């Protein structure tokens, strides 16, 4: 009977734009100020322009000149917008605007009218159900605006249009967009954020996440006074000392001496590094104790280290005890130069010192270890602890100190930068994870952490690695000579960057997992000949990656892992991911001629453009700038792992969209409860519309939410016994039938 709860709470703030660099650009000695373009106001005025354009279309009598698909789209969107509206005048105006379209559709095209009526009877926002397929790739609102609106667009509207031209869903109001985004992952959805224009193929999976994030409110995490980062921990002054024994020395790795114990465990002594002070060691000690104490509350599955002491020893002793090691010189150069070195002593099992990509693990042990590591990572993220140093993933090393990302890899580079369009190459991806802080037992380097609030403020980490996001976005085309400012939508993220960095942290965790799995697969299959089993290895690794993403979704949102995996597989293809990881993470392709490499790439990228690169392959390595260590992608090119990017964006989008959909559902629920209990006086039709709307905002694949909505509907029917309910009876009957079927299937056992 121990309470299992987190010490961190979630809430909202007005803005993250507090105590961060001013919005200016110093270009050629000139200060150019930077300003924001309001997303919501621009979107709303664009919708108003669309309504006026629809009025013009009605007056112009050219309904028969337009395809029936566009007329159906306009009609369904108008009905959905009228439903979402609250003001009576606006709702009536929109309904009158839609009436002639419905009359025409019923008259001259009954076939589509039948499906329109089905959708109207099936949902309160029929447009989202109508658009969950390739139809969404057609921008009917923008087409109508450009056709019937002769006045030029303002600079704000032009910017909004040039950033969000892919689809009309980007112009929907918040609840409708959130509902459509949530339902686009459903089982009966064929939507894919990709369309093939005449020249090339346009992927815009990241634009969905950007348009979602621009609609949210700033997030705050509040840490309880009992939290590790809210406590004035006392001194670590202790009397315990460890007895060095060169006889018992198991080995040396990095800056750590491993000695055996009669209990079959390992005592590890971590010697101070050159530049790191005592603060790092004491912080690691404190974090280890904090995690060990609270393991039951947080439900962490890792075999956590047991610290023993953090004190100072003579360097000569360290040298004397490590004489017989096979790696004595490297250890000598690593450790500090002072005569007395701070050390941190702990006790851990054998598996704590074997990296998760070790080749001496069978697939089942690797699966278990990966599951443990992912669970611990994301549970601790929910606890308010971030691990920005699991691995050292570098995009590039050339101008590292000059460029604003400092050469660090950004898993969501499209969201965090101006005029970046897709993920770049990974420099020496093998050695990025060779000393990864994920082990066969669980998390290892616990001291190298940050509070989660460090992401939502202008801390040293945020200011060091994300200054383009914190400062603002500048480009010469943004400059407005009339005002002298640079207006872009990117600067508007100054008040929300915490959410972006949260999603980036999740994506980077998953990317580290992917690279570790790839390294394991490459090492295992390097000395193998039987091709089918070599393929089976990579197929299993792909399944593990997808399961890890689904587990992350389940922990962050609460969706069951099976449904999370189904929703993920809707948007990301495991076959392509397996093929691409197998192709690019091994050196085989380096032994092929141009024609053969292209012929195989045809099979790797099924239905998509093949990876293009002009780099010269290194024999036995592949793509490598330094000529020794392979890297993922050509120089100045994007990454060849397309399904990996799709999977990362699908994961983060699912998490954030689920949270936003929950918020919308609960505000609608509060309105419904107010109406039912009497604080709002309205006719029966209004109450029925409110409950139907609530039914539309429920989570896809979740039933208990619809159960609550149906109970509210029945209460409403009791409240107004003398009103018709023909419109909503069908959908609520479907809900009731599902409830009964579930009850029967349950009672069977």
């Amino acid at each position: 009977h121990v309470k299992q709860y987190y010490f961190a709470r979630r809430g909202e703030t007005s803005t993250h734009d507090t105590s961060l660099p001013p919005p200016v650009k110093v270009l050629s000695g000139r200060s150019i100020p930077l300003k924001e373009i309001p997303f919501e106001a621009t979107r709303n005025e664009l919708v108003q322009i669309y309504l006026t354009s629809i009025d013009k279309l009605i007056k112009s009598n050219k309904l028969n000149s337009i395809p029936s698909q566009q007329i159906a789209s306009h009609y369904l969107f108008l009905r959905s917008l009228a439903n979402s509206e609250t003001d009576g005048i606006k709702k009536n105006q929109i309904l009158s605007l839609a009436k002639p379209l419905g009359t025409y559709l019923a008259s001259k095209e009954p076939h589509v009218w039948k499906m329109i009526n089905e959708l109207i009877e099936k949902s309160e926002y029929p447009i989202i159900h109508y658009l969950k397929n390739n139809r969404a790739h057609s921008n009917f609102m923008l087409a109508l605006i450009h056709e019937y609106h002769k006045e030029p667009l303002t600079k704000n509207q032009s910017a909004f249009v040039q950033k969000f031209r892919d689809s009309s869903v980007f112009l929907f109001p918040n609840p409708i967009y959130t509902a459509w985004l949530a339902h686009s992952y459903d089982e009966d959805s064929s939507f894919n954020p990709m369309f093939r224009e005449r020249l090339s193929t346009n992927f815009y999976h990241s634009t969905l996440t950007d348009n979602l994030l621009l609609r949210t409110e700033p997030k705050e995490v509040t840490l309880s006074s009992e939290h590790h980062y809210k406590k004035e921990k006392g001194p670590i002054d202790s009397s315990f000392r460890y007895q060095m024994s060169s006889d018992r020395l198991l080995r040396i790795q990095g800056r750590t001496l491993l000695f055996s114990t009669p209990q079959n465990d390992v005592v590890a002594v971590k010697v101070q590094k050159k530049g790191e002070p005592k603060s790092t060691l004491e912080e690691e000690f404190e974090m280890a104790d904090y995690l060990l104490k609270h393991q039951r509350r947080l439900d962490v599955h890792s075999k956590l280290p047991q610290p023993l002491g953090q004190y100072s020893v003579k360097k000569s002793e360290i040298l004397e005890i490590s004489r017989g090691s096979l790696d004595f010189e490297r250890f000598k150069t690593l450790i500090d130069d002072s005569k007395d070195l701070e050390v941190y002593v702990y006790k851990a099992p054998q598996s704590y010192f074997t990296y998760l990509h070790d080749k001496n693990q069978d697939l089942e042990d690797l699966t278990a270890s990966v599951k443990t590591n992912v669970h611990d990572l994301f549970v601790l993220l929910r606890e308010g602890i971030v691990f920005p140093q699991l691995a050292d993933i570098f995009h590039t090393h050339f101008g590292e100190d000059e460029r604003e990302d400092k050469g660090r890899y950004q898993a969501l580079v499209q969201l965090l930068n101006v005029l970046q369009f897709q993920l770049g190459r990974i420099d020496k991806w093998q050695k990025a994870v060779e000393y990864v802080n994920l082990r066969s037992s669980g998390l290892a380097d616990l001291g190298d952490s940050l509070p989660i609030t460090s992401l939502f403020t202008s801390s040293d980490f945020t200011k060091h690695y994300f200054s383009e996001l914190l400062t603002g976005g500048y480009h010469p085309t943004f400059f407005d000579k009339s005002s002298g400012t640079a207006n872009s939508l990117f600067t508007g993220k100054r008040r929300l960057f915490g959410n972006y960095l949260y999603l980036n942290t999740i994506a980077e965790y998953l990317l580290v997992i992917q690279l570790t799995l790839g390294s394991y697969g490459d090492k295992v299959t390097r000395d193998m000949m039987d091709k089918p089993k070599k393929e089976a290895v990579w197929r299993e690794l792909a399944n593990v990656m997808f399961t890890s993403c689904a587990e992350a979704i389940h922990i962050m949102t609460g969706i069951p892992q099976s449904r999370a995996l189904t929703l993920l597989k809707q948007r990301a293809n495991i076959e392509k991911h397996f093929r691409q990881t197998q192709f690019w993470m091994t050196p085989d392709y380096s032994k092929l001629d141009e024609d053969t490499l292209q012929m195989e790439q045809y099979s790797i990228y099924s239905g998509e453009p093949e990876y293009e690169f002009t780099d010269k392959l290194v024999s036995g390595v592949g793509l490598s700038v330094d000529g020794v260590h392979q890297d993922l992608g050509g120089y100045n090119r994007e990454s060849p792992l397309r399904e990996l990017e799709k999977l990362l964006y699908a994961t983060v989008t699912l998490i954030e969209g689920t949270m936003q959909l929950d918020k919308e559902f609960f505000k609608q629920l509060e309105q419904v409860e107010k109406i039912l209990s009497g604080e709002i006086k309205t006719d029966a039709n209004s109450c029925f519309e409110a409950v139907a709307q609530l039914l539309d905002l429920a989570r896809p694949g979740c039933h208990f939410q619809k159960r609550l909505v149906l109970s509210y509907y029945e209460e409403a029917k009791l409240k107004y016994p003398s009103a018709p309910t023909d419109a909503y009876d069908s959908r609520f009957q479907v809900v009731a039938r599902t409830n009964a079927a579930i009850t029967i299937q349950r009672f069977w056992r």
Partner: protein, 133 residues
């Protein structure tokens, strides 16, 4: 114990009704969770549940405690009458007639989704009291 599907549903509902995501829900929204899971409580019983557990002063329930409370509430709440309520939902006519093909279709497409070919065998008129045996 509870079923795996039941535990998954309870966990998802608990997460959905945990507004600030600390791992616990307050007393105000416990009734909403109960109603959401089908066990709509009376005012007296709901007030009893609010007072008894939350007299600790903290006023929050963690997931294991919620599981215990629901397992208790489900110890004796669903007798055979509630079980046959769902069977009667399909009762288009009062004769207790349901085509077995209709049961197969509803159990496959409209519910949890090969099991039906074995369920039906143990199961054209399907009298309701016949099967609940």
């Amino acid at each position: 114990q509870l079923t795996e599907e039941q535990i998954a549903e309870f966990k998802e509902a608990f997460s959905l009704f945990d507004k600030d995501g600390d791992g616990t829900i307050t007393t105000k929204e416990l009734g909403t969770v109960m109603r959401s899971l089908g066990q709509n409580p009376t005012e007296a019983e709901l007030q009893d549940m609010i007072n008894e557990v939350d007299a600790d002063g903290n006023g929050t329930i963690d997931f294991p405690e919620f599981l215990t409370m629901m397992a208790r509430k489900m110890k004796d709440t669903d007798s055979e009458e509630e079980i046959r309520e769902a069977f009667r939902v399909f009762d288009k006519d009062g004769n207790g007639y349901i085509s077995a093909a209709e049961l197969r279709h509803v159990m496959t497409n409209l519910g949890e989704k090969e099991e039906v070919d074995e369920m039906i065998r143990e199961a054209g008129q399907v009298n309701y009291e016949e099967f609940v045996q």
